[PDB]
Amino acid sequence: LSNRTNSRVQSFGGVPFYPGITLETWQKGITNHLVAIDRAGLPLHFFIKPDKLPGLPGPLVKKLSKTVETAVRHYYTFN
Amino acid sequence: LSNRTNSRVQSFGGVPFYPGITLETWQKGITNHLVAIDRAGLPLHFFIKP
Amino acid sequence: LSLGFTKALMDICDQLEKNQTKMATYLAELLILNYGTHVITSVDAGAALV
Amino acid sequence: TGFQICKNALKLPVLEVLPGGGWDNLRNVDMGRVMDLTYTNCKTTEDGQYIIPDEVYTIPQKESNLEMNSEVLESWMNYQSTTSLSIN
Amino acid sequence: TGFQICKNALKLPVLEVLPGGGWDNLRNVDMGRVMDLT
Amino acid sequence: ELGFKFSVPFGGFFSCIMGNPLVNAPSLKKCPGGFSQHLAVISDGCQVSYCVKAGIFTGGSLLPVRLPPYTKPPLM
Amino acid sequence: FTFGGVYQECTELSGDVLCQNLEQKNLLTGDFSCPPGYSPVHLLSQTHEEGYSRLECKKKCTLKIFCKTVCEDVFRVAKAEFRAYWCVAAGQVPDNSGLLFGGVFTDKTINPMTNAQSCPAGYIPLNLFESLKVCVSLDYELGFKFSVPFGGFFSCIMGNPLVNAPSLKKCPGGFSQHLAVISDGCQVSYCVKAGIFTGGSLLPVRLPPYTKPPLM
Ligand SMILES: *[C@@H]1O[C@H](CO)[C@@H](O)[C@H](O)[C@H]1NC(C)=O
Numbered sequence: 211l212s213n214r215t216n217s218r219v220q221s222f223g224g225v226p227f228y229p230g231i232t233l234e235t236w237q238k239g240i241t242n243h244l245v246a247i248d249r250a251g252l253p254l255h256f257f258i259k260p261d262k263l264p265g266l267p268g269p270l271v272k273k274l275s276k277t278v279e280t281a282v283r284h285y286y287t288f289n
Numbered sequence: 290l291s292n293r294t295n296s297r298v299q300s301f302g303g304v305p306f307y308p309g310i311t312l313e314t315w316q317k318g319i320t321n322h323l324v325a326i327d328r329a330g331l332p333l334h335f336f337i338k339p
Numbered sequence: 340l341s342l343g344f345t346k347a348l349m350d351i352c353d354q355l356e357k358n359q360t361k362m363a364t365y366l367a368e369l370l371i372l373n374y375g376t377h378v379i380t381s382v383d384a385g386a387a388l389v
Numbered sequence: 390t391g392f393q394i395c396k397n398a399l400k401l402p403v404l405e406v407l408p409g410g411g412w413d414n415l416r417n418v419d420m421g422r423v424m425d426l427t428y429t430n431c432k433t434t435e436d437g438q439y440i441i442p443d444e445v446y447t448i449p450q451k452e453s454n455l456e457m458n459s460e461v462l463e464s465w466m467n468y469q470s471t472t473s474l475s476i477n
Numbered sequence: 478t479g480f481q482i483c484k485n486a487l488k489l490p491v492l493e494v495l496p497g498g499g500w501d502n503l504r505n506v507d508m509g510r511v512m513d514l515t
Numbered sequence: 516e517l518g519f520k521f522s523v524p525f526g527g528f529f530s531c532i533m534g535n536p537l538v539n540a541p542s543l544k545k546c547p548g549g550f551s552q553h554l555a556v557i558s559d560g561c562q563v564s565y566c567v568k569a570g571i572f573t574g575g576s577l578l579p580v581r582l583p584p585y586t587k588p589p590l591m
Numbered sequence: 592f593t594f595g596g597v598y599q600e601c602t603e604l605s606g607d608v609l610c611q612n613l614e615q616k617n618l619l620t621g622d623f624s625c626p627p628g629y630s631p632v633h634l635l636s637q638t639h640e641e642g643y644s645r646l647e648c649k650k651k652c653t654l655k656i657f658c659k660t661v662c663e664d665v666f667r668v669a670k671a672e673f674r675a676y677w678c679v680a681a682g683q684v685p686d687n688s689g690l691l692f693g694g695v696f697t698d699k700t701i702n703p704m705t706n707a708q709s710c711p712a713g714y715i716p717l718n719l720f721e722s723l724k725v726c727v728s729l730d731y732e733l734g735f736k737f738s739v740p741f742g743g744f745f746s747c748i749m750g751n752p753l754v755n756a757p758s759l760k761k762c763p764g765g766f767s768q769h770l771a772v773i774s775d776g777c778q779v780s781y782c783v784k785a786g787i788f789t790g791g792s793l794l795p796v797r798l799p800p801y802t803k804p805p806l807m
């Protein structure tokens with residue numbers, strides 16, 4: 211006789227799994243434990259505007275945005 | 290012997306589906322979960338008026 | 340905007356005003372390290388189990 | 390900017406999945422917080438489960454996907470041979 | 478624009494599916510809240 | 516009237532082997548004018564597409580709710 | 592460049608059981624061919640074996656008077672060779688009359704172009720290999736706003752002929768190669784812009800503004 215039972219369980223969020231929990235309890239246990247599975251973002255240099263920072267002048271924040279975006283470009287090109 | 294079972298569930302609103310639920314409880318559990326199944330909008334340039 | 344990030348922008352602007360491109364690049368790289376490349380604008384809270 | 394007052398007043402857990410942080414697309418981890426989150430008004434979610442900060446809003450795009458693929462392959466092979474010889 | 482007072486008063490949850498948000502016709506996702514909900 | 520209030524102006528049909536004859540006899544599988552082609556059905560690998568105005572169908576789940584005004588707010 | 596379509600020819604060498612679903616004609620022509628103005632290019636030709644048990648009943652009559660229906664089961668290993676080709680723009684093809692590439696996905700991989708093992712709206716899943724699906728999009732605006740301009744395919748034995756007849760498995764221009772599927776050790780890759788595909792789980796939500804911030 212030969213018996214081989216392999217179970218691989220991968221969880222993201224919710225109550226941690228173990229063989230002693232039913233699927234109902236796992237599904238109802240996600241009331242507090244939450245994990246972001248998907249997300250979207252925007253480049254950081256696009257929010258830099260005098261409209262976002264009225265305190266600073268125009269050309270100063272413009273140069274700030276220019277150096278930030280060229281830093282990002284150098285960062286992406288290095289790798 | 291060969292057995293093949295394929296289940297696909299696609300929900301929109303309501304209690305998160307699990308194998309151990311009947312449709313009665315699912316329908317009675319919609320009293321607090323709802324998602325916009327349909328929508329209708331207007332152009333935003335149409336609002337900014339005197 | 341967050342206080343630390345605004346302060347970092349203030350420091351970068353002040354360094355640029357002094358006509359110094361040496362420390363400006365290093366500070367920009369440090370800011371990139373501290374605050375990543377993209378600011379998250381939307382997330383999808385949820386759970387998964389395989 | 391402390392939400393402990395919200396917890397004491399509403400006795401409800403605040404949402405732990407909050408956007409607005411800086412994310413590197415290269416190594417894919419969080420580096421810090423760029424947005425400021427405030428709890429002056431203790432803005433609660435619609436369904437009464439969390440108290441999001443005043444700088445975010447939640448859309449209830451509740452979706453559930455469950456897939457179950459169970460494949461069973463059974464094989465059996467039995468062979469019986471009974472040989473009887475008698476010489477008298 | 479806090480509806481919590483209504484929750485403490487009537488002890489009855491609030492509607493989550495609410496209009497007035499901006500919807501992009503291209504990627505089809507909400508982008509922000511335009512109308513004010515009092 | 517029901518067609519005018521619900522239907523969309525049509526451009527023509529064309530398939531994997533035959534094109535719209537309204538282009539301007541050679542036949543080309545290309546929607547004429549400002550009409551764009553959109554897929555309708557696939558029959559054993561033969562593509563079927565129809566030509567309609569691009570303004571109506573924009574590829575969004577949002578309902579094309581267009582009624583009044585029939586002119587922009589007139590200037591002073 | 593311009594991608595005119597793909598088609599997978601299926602040739603049966605024993606029986607007619609494996610080519611019933613593993614064949615796929617060209618989308619634009621409805622056959623195993625290429626649209627006018629395109630040059631069919633051998634992408635990859637490979638083989639596939641599969642064992643199946645067929646039960647067949649035969650009515651055998653011995654001496655024309657002893658007739659009997661006997662049913663027998665035979666386990667046959669069907670062999671079929673499948674050839675996938677692809678249509679590239681031979682010259683100045685009319686624009687924008689052509690097809691676009693919306694990404695690929697398999698049963699074991701994930702397609703970042705849609706973050707899911709499927710295709711976006713306005714995309715048809717077309718079968719090229721035993722497990723490779725290609726998202727094929729027809730609308731001009733839908734492809735322009737969702738799909739990505741394409742450079743060409745190449746395989747373990749054939750390269751992209753658009754390099755500038757010797758064949759090199761190199762992406763021309765600023766385009767980059769990325770894996771699509773593995774078919775019995777033969778690497779399959781496609782050339783696309785490196786900017787759109789950065790290998791990050793972040794969704795490339797690039798919309799407005801369409802310009803860097805204008806100076807005062
Ligand atoms: C273990 O072996 C027995 C045979 O004695 C078999 O019936 C059973 O399916 C095997 N697996 C488990 C999980 O018991």
Ligand SMILES: *[C@@H]1O[C@H](CO)[C@@H](O)[C@H](O)[C@H]1NC(C)=O
Pocket residue numbers: 290291292294
């Ligand atoms: C599984 O196999 C058995 C045969 O033992 C069959 O009766 C049954 O319908 C199959 N499916 C399920 C879901 O049990």
